[PDB]
Amino acid sequence: MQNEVGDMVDLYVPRKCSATNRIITAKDHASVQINIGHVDENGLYDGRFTTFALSGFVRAQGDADGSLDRLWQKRK
Amino acid sequence: ELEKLKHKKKRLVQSPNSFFMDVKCQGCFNITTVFSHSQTVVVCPGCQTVLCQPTGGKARLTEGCSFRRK
Amino acid sequence: KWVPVTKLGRLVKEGRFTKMEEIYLHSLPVKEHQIVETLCPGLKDEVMKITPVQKQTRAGQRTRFKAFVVVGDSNGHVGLGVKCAKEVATAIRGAIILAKLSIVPVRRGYWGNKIGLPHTVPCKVTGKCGSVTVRMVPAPRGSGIVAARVPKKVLQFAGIDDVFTSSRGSTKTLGNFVKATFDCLMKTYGFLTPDFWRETTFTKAPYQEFTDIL
Amino acid sequence: GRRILNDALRTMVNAERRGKATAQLQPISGVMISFLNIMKHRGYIKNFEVFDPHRVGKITVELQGRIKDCKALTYRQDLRATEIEKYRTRMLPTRQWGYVVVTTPNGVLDHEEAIRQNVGGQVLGYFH
Amino acid sequence: GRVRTKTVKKTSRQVIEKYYSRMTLDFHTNKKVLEEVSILQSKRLRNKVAGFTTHLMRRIQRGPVRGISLKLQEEERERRMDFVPEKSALEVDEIRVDKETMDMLAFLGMADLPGVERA
Amino acid sequence: RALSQKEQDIQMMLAADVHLGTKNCDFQMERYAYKRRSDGIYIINLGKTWEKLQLAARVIVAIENPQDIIVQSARPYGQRAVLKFAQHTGANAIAGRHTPGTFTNQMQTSFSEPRLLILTDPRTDHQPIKESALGNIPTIAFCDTDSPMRYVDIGIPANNKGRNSIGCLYWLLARMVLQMRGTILPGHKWDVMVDLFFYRDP
Amino acid sequence: TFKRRNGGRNKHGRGHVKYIRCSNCAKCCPKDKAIKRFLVRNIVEQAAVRDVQEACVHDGYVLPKLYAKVHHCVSCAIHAHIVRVRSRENRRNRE
RNA sequence: CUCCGCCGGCACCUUAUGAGAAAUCAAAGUCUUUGGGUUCCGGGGGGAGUAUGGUCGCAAGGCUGAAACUUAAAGGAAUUGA
Ligand SMILES: [Mg+2]
Ligand SMILES: [Mg+2]
Ligand SMILES: [Mg+2]
Ligand SMILES: [Mg+2]
Ligand SMILES: [Mg+2]
Ligand SMILES: [Mg+2]
Ligand SMILES: [Zn+2]
Numbered sequence: 001m002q003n004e005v006g007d008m009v010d011l012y013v014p015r016k017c018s019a020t021n022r023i024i025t026a027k028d029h030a031s032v033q034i035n036i037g038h039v040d041e042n043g044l045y046d047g048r049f050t051t052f053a054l055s056g057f058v059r060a061q062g063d064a065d066g067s068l069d070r071l072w073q074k075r076k
Numbered sequence: 077e078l079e080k081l082k083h084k085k086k087r088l089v090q091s092p093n094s095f096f097m098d099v100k101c102q103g104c105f106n107i108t109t110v111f112s113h114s115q116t117v118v119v120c121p122g123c124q125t126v127l128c129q130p131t132g133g134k135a136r137l138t139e140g141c142s143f144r145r146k
Numbered sequence: 147k148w149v150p151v152t153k154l155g156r157l158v159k160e161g162r163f164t165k166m167e168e169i170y171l172h173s174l175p176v177k178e179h180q181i182v183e184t185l186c187p188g189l190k191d192e193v194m195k196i197t198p199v200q201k202q203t204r205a206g207q208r209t210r211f212k213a214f215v216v217v218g219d220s221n222g223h224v225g226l227g228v229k230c231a232k233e234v235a236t237a238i239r240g241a242i243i244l245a246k247l248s249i250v251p252v253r254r255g256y257w258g259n260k261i262g263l264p265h266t267v268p269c270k271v272t273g274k275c276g277s278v279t280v281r282m283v284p285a286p287r288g289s290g291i292v293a294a295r296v297p298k299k300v301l302q303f304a305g306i307d308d309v310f311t312s313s314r315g316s317t318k319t320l321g322n323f324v325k326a327t328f329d330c331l332m333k334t335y336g337f338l339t340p341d342f343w344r345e346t347t348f349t350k351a352p353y354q355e356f357t358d359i360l
Numbered sequence: 361g362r363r364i365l366n367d368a369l370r371t372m373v374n375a376e377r378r379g380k381a382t383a384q385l386q387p388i389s390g391v392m393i394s395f396l397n398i399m400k401h402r403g404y405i406k407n408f409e410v411f412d413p414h415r416v417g418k419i420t421v422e423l424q425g426r427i428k429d430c431k432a433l434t435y436r437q438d439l440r441a442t443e444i445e446k447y448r449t450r451m452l453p454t455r456q457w458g459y460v461v462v463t464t465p466n467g468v469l470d471h472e473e474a475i476r477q478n479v480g481g482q483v484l485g486y487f488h
Numbered sequence: 489g490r491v492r493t494k495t496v497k498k499t500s501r502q503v504i505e506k507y508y509s510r511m512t513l514d515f516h517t518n519k520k521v522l523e524e525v526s527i528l529q530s531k532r533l534r535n536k537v538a539g540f541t542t543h544l545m546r547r548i549q550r551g552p553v554r555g556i557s558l559k560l561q562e563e564e565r566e567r568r569m570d571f572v573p574e575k576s577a578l579e580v581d582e583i584r585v586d587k588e589t590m591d592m593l594a595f596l597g598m599a600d601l602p603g604v605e606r607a
Numbered sequence: 608r609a610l611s612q613k614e615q616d617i618q619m620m621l622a623a624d625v626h627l628g629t630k631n632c633d634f635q636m637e638r639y640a641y642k643r644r645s646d647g648i649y650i651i652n653l654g655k656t657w658e659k660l661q662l663a664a665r666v667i668v669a670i671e672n673p674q675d676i677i678v679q680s681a682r683p684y685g686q687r688a689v690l691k692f693a694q695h696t697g698a699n700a701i702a703g704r705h706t707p708g709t710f711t712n713q714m715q716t717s718f719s720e721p722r723l724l725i726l727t728d729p730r731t732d733h734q735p736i737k738e739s740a741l742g743n744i745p746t747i748a749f750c751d752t753d754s755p756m757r758y759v760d761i762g763i764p765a766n767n768k769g770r771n772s773i774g775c776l777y778w779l780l781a782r783m784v785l786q787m788r789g790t791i792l793p794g795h796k797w798d799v800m801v802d803l804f805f806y807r808d809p
Numbered sequence: 810t811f812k813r814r815n816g817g818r819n820k821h822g823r824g825h826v827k828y829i830r831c832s833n834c835a836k837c838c839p840k841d842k843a844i845k846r847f848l849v850r851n852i853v854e855q856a857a858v859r860d861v862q863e864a865c866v867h868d869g870y871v872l873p874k875l876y877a878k879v880h881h882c883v884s885c886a887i888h889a890h891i892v893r894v895r896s897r898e899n900r901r902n903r904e
Numbered sequence: 905c906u907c908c909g910c911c912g913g914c915a916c917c918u919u920a921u922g923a924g925a926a927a928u929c930a931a932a933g934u935c936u937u938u939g940g941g942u943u944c945c946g947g948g949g950g951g952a953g954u955a956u957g958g959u960c961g962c963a964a965g966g967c968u969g970a971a972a973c974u975u976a977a978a979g980g981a982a983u984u985g986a
Pocket of ligand 2: 824
């Protein structure tokens with residue numbers, strides 16, 4: 001990461017699985033990036049969604065469903 | 077809850093499955109306390125009658141012996 | 147000319163990417179080799195081993211020649227392609243296509259003082275394939291690349307300038323040996339470091355960002 | 361037999377490498393609690409709840425999945441404050457992060473603290 | 489030893505797809521039909537194809553058939569596929585469920601639910 | 608008074624034979640199977656089913672271009688269901704059998720880069736699940752109580768082995784996708800009736 | 810190269826299994842390695858059932874069946890085609 | 905006899921997210937990101953479990969056990985063929 005001068009030297013700070021916090025490599029093709037839209041009122045949609053990242057490990061476990069369930073129990 | 081299913085020493089806080097029970101027989105309206113897993117026969121001091129029979133688990137009560145867990 | 151057949155290849159042909167970082171960040175499968183040719187232009191190709199395998203038939207033995215090529219730029223993108231074909235010409239072409247379809251990132255690090263450009267690998271890292279295994283340990287600046295000739299030819303392409311290598315297993319099999327060095331390099335962004343701890347605000351995927359063009 | 365501080369460290373490694381949220385450790389110790397404190401203080405696990413009903417004890421730690429490894433170097437060596445520095449290279453992924461946890465006469469504490477206080481000790485384990 | 493090959497069979501499927509109402513069942517008509525709707529270079533292949541499309545006609549003219557795509561029969565099999573009753577058949581005035589199902593409803597707070605009856 | 612959409616639709620699903628799972632359960636979805644009838648057969652928490660039905664609806668309606676979604680069924684009970692689901696939601700249904708390579712074989716004639724995949728049965732459509740696992744394709748699957756949920760992102764716990772269940776489930780997903788995209792104005796009146804989805808056996 | 814998980818025999822929890830004699834050749838093979846079939850064969854085949862039930866003295870008589878339990882070894886089983894060499898995959902099922 | 909659940913056995917079936925040279929293994933896993941404890945034991949193939957020395961045994965034998973010299977392969981797993 002941050003050089004001692006002010007620059008940041010690494011490339012594409014990777015994203016992390018939201019269920020396991022393992023970072024998803026650049027060849028983890030079993031990784032998904034779900035998008036869950038928000039309903040508001042009459043109309044029940046606008047271009048406003050929450051986003052989740054799931055790794056190949058998490059999906060192959062079979063707990064990828066449970067992770068989405070217990071993370072989409074988040075409230076705002 | 078399932079913590080009555082989970083093993084005795086694998087529960088989060090170790091607890092016995094046994095209890096002490098107050099048995100009243102018919103032949104003598106007194107009260108006598110026994111342990112759920114008796115391990116020995118028990119005779120009512122008054123009417124001399126048998127109350128339990130020791131087995132591999134809980135005791136086996138004699139006919140018409142009303143017990144209250146306590 | 148190209149005639150792209152994957153929507154990623156499309157998004158690249160009308161040229162609304164610039165560098166391979168947006169594809170890597172989103173973990174997408176690159177299926178057309180002409181993507182990387184335009185995204186990373188300073189790419190160097192190189193064949194190191196042409197070894198002949200033989201299958202034996204009723205008539206005799208039919209030999210196929212398989213090519214182990216590495217392509218990369220000296221700035222953290224490296225790729226290994228292995229491809230077996232009857233002629234050495236088509237073996238090499240297939241292997242260079244697979245090499246540019248298997249480009250991965252290489253993150254570098256610093257040994258002790260984060261001054262100047264990064265030189266070594268971040269940490270102690272293991273690559274294993276078959277029975278050959280390779281370590282890469284960080285090395286102080288200006289320590290040269292100390293490793294066998296094969297990982298040295300991987301690493302001078304992958305851009306690492308200094309590193310300490312210790313290796314196990316039958317390194318004489320160049321196939322498994324270079325595939326193990328490449329395994330060790332691809333998983334350098336597999337390593338969860340205190341510096342990555344800051345939770346990552348996501349970005350729209352290419353497929354979701356540029357949807358209207360589809 | 362038992363050599364706990366292993367029953368526990370390999371339990372957290374197994375649980376975290378799998379991805380569990382809460383792990384429970386069947387024995388406890390002053391070493392266990394003072395070890396988990398070093399992990400938590402350096403920011404590798406979140407809090408943990410020590411079930412001390414009446415027995416040896418029990419712990420449940422709530423992992424963030426931000427730890428990558430932790431190990432016990434049973435065969436607890438001795439360790440002067442000069443070869444702090446050739447273990448820190450020997451066990452750890454690099455010269456930047458990862459900690460070696462050495463029991464010292466100022467309590468259980470990691471190696472940079474040990475160097476600052478200028479004490480040695482005996483290595484209990486490490487984590488990174 | 490008279491199995492027609494792939495060229496014969498797939499010209500059969502393609503021609504009878506591409507031209508239905510302009511062929512018949514009587515063999516000898518089909519020959520000349522195909523002579524004017526196709527260009528071939530062997531009168532024995534020509535008869536070989538006609539002799540197979542004729543009983544392909546025989547099987548189609550009674551029932552349905554594999555790959556070939558024909559508009560008068562796709563359209564009708566969609567006309568009756570888009571068929572729904574006067575009123576929706578899954579009718580909910582009387583659902584008869586069992587005790588643990590009503591337990592699920594009790595869990596869900598829908599303790600009394602219209603038309604749900606103890607079996 | 609009136610009744611909530613929860614209430615209507617749960618009546619729908621009860622009468623449609625969706626609460627009755629299979630003889631057994633899988634650990635990955637005992638978080639749904641509520642209890643056991645003494646037959647041994649389990650019964651699914653339809654409250655959680657309907658919560659996951661909203662979840663699936665949101666995940667579908669988050670797609671900008673509905674043409675970029677694939678829904679599939681290999682069971683001979685769901686072809687009608689999935690085809691009508693596509694004709695109403697603008698999806699791209701692929702009914703029947705799946706040609707291996709529809710997702711990865713970039714030079715196959717039938718190619719498709721779904722931004723989302725819907726699967727009537729994780730068992731029978733085990734080919735597309737694995738294929739998605741190579742192409743980064745999030746997956747919504749109707750998991751019956753004997754389902755291998757490996758590589759399944761959004762699994763609706765719902766019986767899918769009766770003549771009514773699959774049609775019912777796709778009618779619910781259909782209406783919720785339409786409601787969330789607002790194409791049917793608020794008011795539980797949707798003019799497409801359910802018995803359309805159930806297959807017609809010639 | 811191990812060819813079978815159970816070793817070709819099903820012995821678990823034991824160290825010794827009392828042996829038996831092959832019916833063909835009298836090779837000694839352990840009781841639970843031997844191809845055991847319980848065949849129950851009519852005294853006669855279906856060309857010879859009526860010609861004996863129209864000669865049974867007392868009407869309403871039913872023929873016996875030869876109940877016997879034959880034991881074979883692996884050699885005599887393969888030779889008699891009682892069992893066959895199955896493929897690597899097909900070798901694994903037990904039905 | 906049926907249903908459910910705890911221990912404790914011998915096992916068995918699917919799966920890698922694991923290991924490995926692989927066959928295969930849910931324990932042969934938690935190992936180059938290498939340390940829970942403990943015992944025994946192997947260092948290319950032969951010669952050789954041989955010569956000798958010791959020692960137990962009535963005897964066959966057992967336990968302990970080399971060197972010279974010979975050699976560039978011996979061997980494992982799987983693949984195609986024949
Ligand atoms: Mg035993
Ligand atoms: Mg024996
Ligand atoms: Mg048992
Ligand atoms: Mg030797
Ligand atoms: Mg051998
Ligand atoms: Mg061999
Ligand atoms: Zn025999």
